[PDB]
Amino acid sequence: KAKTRSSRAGLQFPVGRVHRLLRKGNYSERVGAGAPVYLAAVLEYLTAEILELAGNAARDNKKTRIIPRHLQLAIRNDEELNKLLGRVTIAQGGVLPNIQAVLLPKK
Amino acid sequence: PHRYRPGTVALREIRRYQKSTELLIRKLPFQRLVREIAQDFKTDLRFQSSAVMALQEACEAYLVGLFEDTNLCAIHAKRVTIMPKDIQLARRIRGERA
Amino acid sequence: PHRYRPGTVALREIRRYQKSTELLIRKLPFQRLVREIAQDFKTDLRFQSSAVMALQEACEAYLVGLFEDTNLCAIHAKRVTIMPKDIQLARRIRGERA
Amino acid sequence: RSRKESYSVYVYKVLKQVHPDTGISSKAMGIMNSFVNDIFERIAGEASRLAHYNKRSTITSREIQTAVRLLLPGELAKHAVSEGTKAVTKYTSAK
């Protein structure tokens, strides 16, 4: 008889949990039915976007397992994700290869 | 006819503008600029007069602050003349740009 | 008898360390430094292993970021050698002081 | 011996739709957990401010949407808004 609010909304992310985390969070006295559905979809979408590009970067390294380095390379190579995460450190991410042109040897 | 040397009026102007707090952009042009940009986001918008003055106070305090950092960038290069590359190095280090 | 020129091993370390993600400070020295500084705020402290690593990750990412800005401040001054004045300009414009 | 909830189950399912032959390290999964919790906090926080500014007791789909527009850059915002409207469309059409 029971069907998860997620299976109804077409999501892998837990609508039920998002709803509870909104309540136990002191964000507002009340919480509209759709708010946790929307919010769950947004977080899923952004997760797909990152796992998509992290996947591609793992593929380029002849690798099947996404590591933090793959997450860093995807995020910092994307203008929008890099801005969203502009004040965030990926542990064990390292940096993009970048050597200022004038530091390159002459011949 | 007696000329001040280059720099003398520029220092007089630093002293005078650092002493005062009046907005330095003309009110009406700035208001036309706000209306144009807003209109390009949404048509049929109006503005409380205080909304435009808040924008002007925030825009001038931002530009003044940016010129201080820009000036520090020129001087670090052993110049006294700010250039475009000073403003952009400053914005890069402020984290306003990549 | 074969000797690499000045800056040829420097480029190689750059290429090498920009490719890797390992922490670059030896753990024990850093753990000792953490406990010292922390002693001054509350004595008889214990640290989760993950606490100290969080701190080393954050502290290394910070110092790498600062060296990048520092490097841009040196190159802006038509140099290729980072100096205290470059670190100090990067901190000033970032708003970490002055 | 008490429950320590995370998003890992959900991160893993989205991984499989998107890269079905791709795995993910413990450390990488920790980073995706931080990610979800961080954007959760930012969006919920902006939605709370919006409701507070408009003297409202309730965070609806609308506060989430406005929050997403304020917080996501350009194209991310557009696609997030469309994934969000879609999920709320599907869910309002489910007996």
């Binding site: 899923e44 979408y45 797909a48 976007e49 998509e52 590009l53 910092r76 190579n77 994307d78 203008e79 929008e80 890099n82 801005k83 970048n98 200022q100 042109a101 | 952009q88 190095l89 890069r92 740009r97 990549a98 | 841009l72 190159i75 | 989205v14 739709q17 998107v18 194209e75 991310l76 696609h79 469309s82 994934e83 879609k86």
Partner: peptide, 17 residues
């Protein structure tokens, strides 16, 4: 997968490249 992902992704324009 079944997500409305971004068609094109641009890189950020870094100061000093």
């Amino acid at each position: 997968g079944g997500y409305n992902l971004r068609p094109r992704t641009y890189q950020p324009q870094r100061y000093g490249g």
